[PDB]
Design a protein around this ligand. Structure first.
Ligand code: NA
Ligand code: NA
Lengths: 263, 271
């Protein structure tokens, strides 16, 4: 209940469905059932300006997964133009050093789209070049970024947030797709974005999830993981959610998210 | 036998920028810098077979200085394809007595087609763990405006380093740029009117906000200092094995290369 993705195109919808199904299927034996209140799994603004749905599976202890979060947001800006955000993120706990996973599509017009697809690092890459070799050089991650760039309507996306720029790995696909034809953008999605996203997901599941972390290393992991979670919720939710949904709906959803993220 | 500030082989505008930058670094850091004590054999060197030629200029910070060292470099290599490689760079490195960012400017031309600019204040703490460092040194300053300013130019496009390590050691505000170089008179103009002013303004931020005398008695806590030392060491060892160990014996021959690499390792303090 979330898998409806009602406000987006079928191609995008199918991609989000493929990805969420793959995650839930491959990690079933390590994923708890969703425990969010129903008034947090699906919520909206009293005035009808915004609608969202949230799906969070916590991971078992003795397992490497902290949680998995899937979401969609639909928000009709007073102008009449609707903002549609869809995302799947995978967070690993401090029992492993391996990278997280994120896919996010952010679309305002029929022809323009921001893609964020990455396996965010959980160790300092400069202190730990061995980590960099292990999870990014040895894998084929950079090729997805590169292959997507070839396309004439795909250009680099440079976040206005310096924090988001620093939190993604050096292989991250941060892309702005500007296909001035709805037909072309959807063609980009199924032929290009979709195989990229599915392939990035596969290396996360086999190379990061599947497989001891030292006392001070785990403490470092938790500290950095917590810093990431705390800062991003402050930037992304603590002003945009009260605005999109009202202060009633936000406070309870934000609290539920904070609790889930352990912040 | 070509000397450091002579910057041979490159364009007049490219020499002027490198002279101005180094002159500024040395004049503004008078109270900080020891004189260069590199032997002649290392200040200026070349492959015996004439295929490569380089100059090195290193000044270490004094004791009680936040400056570890400043290093200036130019390299000219004739590649067996008949084209020439020209690298000119200036870097400032700070020691464990401060957390503040480093400084780097590099101009690399490997083909007749494009000039690569690297201009940044490399961060010395993990930015995800330390959001406050990101705000202090990159958000509060004007650093990103230079990057997007230079990028508006039609001849200027993003450069993405082949090295995933280079990508992660540069700050999120780094100007990593590729300049169309075929139109020689246009390249000169880009350098003179746009790259020069930007590089000098980034240098100004480093000089005033990172080196910053003001109250030098900011004593770096034990754990913070040890993190800096560890991260600095890892960066340097890795840079040297990627850019020096894998390239210098080829350019200059084993003998010249072992003498030079040794001197660079000494300056960087690396084992
Ligand atoms: Na493109
Ligand atoms: Na441009």
């Amino acid at each position: 209940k979330f898998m409806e993705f009602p406000y987006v195109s079928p191609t995008r919808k199918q991609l989000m469905v493929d990805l969420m199904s793959t995650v839930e299927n491959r990690l079933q034996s390590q994923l708890l059932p969703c425990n969010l209140p129903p008034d947090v799994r699906n919520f909206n603004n009293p005035n009808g300006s915004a609608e969202a749905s949230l799906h969070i599976r916590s991971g078992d202890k003795s397992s490497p997964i902290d949680f998995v979060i899937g979401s969609w947001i639909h928000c009709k800006i007073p102008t009449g133009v609707s903002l549609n955000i869809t995302s799947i993120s995978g967070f690993l706990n401090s029992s492993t050093k391996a990278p997280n996973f994120v896919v996010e599509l952010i679309q305002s017009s029929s022809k323009s789209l921001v893609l964020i697809l990455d396996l965010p690092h959980r160790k300092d890459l400069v202190l730990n070049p061995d980590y960099l070799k292990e999870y990014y050089q040895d894998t084929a991650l950079d090729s997805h970024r590169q292959s997507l760039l070839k396309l004439p309507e795909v250009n680099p996306y440079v976040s206005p947030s310096l924090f988001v720029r620093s939190a993604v790995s050096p292989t991250a696909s941060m892309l702005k797709i500007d296909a001035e034809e709805e037909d072309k953008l959807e063609e980009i999605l199924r032929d290009h974005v979709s195989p990229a996203a599915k392939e990035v997901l596969e290396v996360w599941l086999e190379r990061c999830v599947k497989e001891v972390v030292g006392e001070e290393e785990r403490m470092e992991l938790e500290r950095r993981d917590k810093s990431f979670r705390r800062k991003s919720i402050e930037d992304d939710l603590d002003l945009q959610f009260p605005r999109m949904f009202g202060e009633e709906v936000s406070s309870r959803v934000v609290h539920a998210i904070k609790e889930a993220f352990g912040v």
